[PDB]
Each structure stands twice: as structure tokens, then as C-alpha cells.
Amino acid sequence: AHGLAWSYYIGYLRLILPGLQARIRMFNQLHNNMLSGAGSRRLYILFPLDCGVPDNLSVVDPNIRFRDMLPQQNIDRAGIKNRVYSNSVYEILENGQPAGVCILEYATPLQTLFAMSQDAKAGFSREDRLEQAKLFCRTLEEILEDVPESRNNCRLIVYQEPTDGNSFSLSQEVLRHIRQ
Amino acid sequence: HGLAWSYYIGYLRLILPGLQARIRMFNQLHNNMLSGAGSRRLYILFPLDCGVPDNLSVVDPNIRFRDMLPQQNIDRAGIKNRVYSNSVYEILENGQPAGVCILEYATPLQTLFAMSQDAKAGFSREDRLEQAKLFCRTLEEILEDVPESRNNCRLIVYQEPTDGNSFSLSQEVLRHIRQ
Numbered sequence A: 001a002h003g004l005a006w007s008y009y010i011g012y013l014r015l016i017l018p019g020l021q022a023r024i025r026m027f028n029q030l031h032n033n034m035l036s037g038a039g040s041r042r043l044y045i046l047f048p049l050d051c052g053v054p055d056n057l058s059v060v061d062p063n064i065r066f067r068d069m070l071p072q073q074n075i076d077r078a079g080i081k082n083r084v085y086s087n088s089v090y091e092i093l094e095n096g097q098p099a100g101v102c103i104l105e106y107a108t109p110l111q112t113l114f115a116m117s118q119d120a121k122a123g124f125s126r127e128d129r130l131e132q133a134k135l136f137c138r139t140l141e142e143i144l145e146d147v148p149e150s151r152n153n154c155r156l157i158v159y160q161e162p163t164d165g166n167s168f169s170l171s172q173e174v175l176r177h178i179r180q
Numbered sequence B: 001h002g003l004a005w006s007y008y009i010g011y012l013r014l015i016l017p018g019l020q021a022r023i024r025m026f027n028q029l030h031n032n033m034l035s036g037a038g039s040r041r042l043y044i045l046f047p048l049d050c051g052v053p054d055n056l057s058v059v060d061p062n063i064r065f066r067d068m069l070p071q072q073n074i075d076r077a078g079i080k081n082r083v084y085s086n087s088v089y090e091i092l093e094n095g096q097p098a099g100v101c102i103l104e105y106a107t108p109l110q111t112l113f114a115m116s117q118d119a120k121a122g123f124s125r126e127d128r129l130e131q132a133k134l135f136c137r138t139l140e141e142i143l144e145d146v147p148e149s150r151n152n153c154r155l156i157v158y159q160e161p162t163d164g165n166s167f168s169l170s171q172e173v174l175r176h177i178r179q
């Protein structure tokens, strides 16, 4: 997970965080100032420690609704001309009402950990996977301390699903951060 | 081991099944540029010292960008229409175009390089070479069990000769196209 965390910084957050606010301003110009709130001008990244990462947020929560993409960012990377980095804007509902708008996505390496843990060859225990997911988050959190752009450009949302019958709403969790 | 799985799961598993279709479309738009069977695979560069320049022409001027394949869009981890893109290069020999292929570096190696230069990472130069070797070996293993979508990629693993001459990238790439 140490390698995965450094990879997520070096290969993604390092590249995308410095240009984010510029892309937000452009989005606001094209889309009637939709992301004008201070709570809306951050990349919110979901870290499900259980590592269940769907490709569509509607698979896990009906209240997280795709609206539009930010302008794409093109960067020449490792031989690939104009490799494209993209981010998606979601509206978060609360009892049918549009309660917040944000840029949202999952931390992609957690999807890798899931698939890897369950493979016949390279697999490892669920408990090892949870250890690794936590070690991934902690290592990324450590890395981002030397990165000043981190503080105002992203929000790390780390959580586990309950298995005891207690309520947890992902939409509610995102909204709580937006509203703060 | 972890980086190799990320590279398979998060990339090669996603793009290899769709590659031939993109190659057909590319050929329809660019005069069968990728006509030879040697030109119909993704060639991926694996420098064992983990040096990954972002621009291939800067490290070997006999390798020159021509065009991109059509983009592939996939919904990924909350990103709608995440974009996957590949680049086509011509390779010169004795100063004249002698081959054309889809070429790139294995991006995770650049992470290993960068880690070896940042003290926070606790990651030595020896650590780097070991992990680079392990990364390549692990990936070859993965691709065995995915026999389909072989014919779709070739791995070019290389290092500088121990007490030999500078390794020619363009010549290594032609050797693989022609093999």
C-alpha cells in the first residue's frame, strides 16, 4: 500500500491539484456559477476502507447524481501525448432536494486492492486488505503534509460500512463536508 | 507486486480487449499506417533503471510522434468517460522511416524512480532496481493467464549493458516490430 499511495500522489494528485481551481473557474463560466460555493471548490475523494468501489456512484447511493465534467486536462506522460485527466461534478440530493454540488470520485487504488485481494494467485486475506487500505490512507495523508496545494484543493473522505444495522448514508457524509 | 497488479487491473485489462477495434478505425482514417502485423500491438517500454522520460523523441530522436489512436472512454471509479489514449510513433533507421508502432513507457516505473529521489519514501536505488525487476516478472506472469489479449501487447524489458555500449532504443523497438 506504500507503493500504491506514492503512485497515487506522483502519478495523479501531484499532476492535477495545481490546475484544479483554474478548471473550476472555467466550469463556473460555462455552467452558470454552479460550483461557486467554497464547499464546492474542492476535489472530494472517497476512500471506502472496505474497498468496494463501483464505477457508477448510483450503484451505491441513489442521491449522488452525475451532472457534468470539468474541462479536461491534457499532459504529455511517459510517451503518451496529451494523456487526459478528467473529473466529474455531482449533485447530492437530500429528500429529493438539490442540497450540494461538488467534484467527486473514488480513490482508484482501492479498486485495485479489492480485485487483487480476491485473485487466486496474488490474493490475500480480507483482513490484510483492510490493513493495506488503512496503510494506503495513512501513507497518502503523510505525503500530502509536504504538499501545500493539498489543503484547499482536495478533501479526503475515509469510511467503513456498518455491519451491525446502524445507518450510514454516503450522500449524507459528502454533504456534511460540503456544508462545513 | 502491488504496482504490477494496479497496472493490469487498472489499465491493460481495460484497454487490450478494445485495442484492435481502435487500430482498425485508426487505419481507416490514416491510410493503413498500421498495416503490418508487427504494427498491430501495443509496445510497452520497461527500462530497468526506471528512467521514464515523458517525451520519447528527446531520448532518441529516431523515434518520432505521428498521431494518436482514437480515444477510448470508460466510466471508472466515479469518473464518467475516463479517457484512455495511445500514441503512434515512426522509428527511423539510417535516417529514414523504417517502422511504425503504438509505443509508450510503463508509467509505474516513473513512480519507482521518483520514490528513489524523495527521502520521505524510504526507498533506495537498490530497492528501485529490485522492484523494477519484480514488477516486470509479475506482469509477465499475469499476462500468461490472460492468453487472449496477448497478440495485443508486447513488453520490451531492457537495461544498459554491464560493460558494453549505449543501448539503442530505436533499434530495440525495430527488433520487436520485425520479430
Ligand SMILES: Nc1nc(=O)c2ncn([C@@H]3O[C@@H]4COP(=O)(O)O[C@H]5[C@@H](O)[C@H](n6cnc7c(N)ncnc76)O[C@@H]5COP(=O)(O)O[C@@H]3[C@@H]4O)c2[nH]1
Binding pocket: A007, A008, A011, A012, A078, A080, A083, A084, A085, A086, A107, A108, A109, A112, B003, B006, B007, B008, B010, B011, B079, B082, B083, B084, B085, B104, B107, B108, B111
Ligand atoms: N499509461 C497509461 N495511460 C492511462 O490512461 C492509464 N490509466 C491508468 N494507467 C496506469 O495504470 C495503473 C493503474 O491506474 P489506476 O487508475 O488504477 O491508478 C492510478 C489512478 O488512481 C491514478 N490515476 C492516474 N491517472 C488517473 C486519472 N486519470 N484519473 C484518476 N486516477 C488516475 O493514479 C494511479 C497512478 O497512476 P499511473 O502512474 O499513471 O499509473 C496507472 C497505474 O499504475 C494508465 N496508464
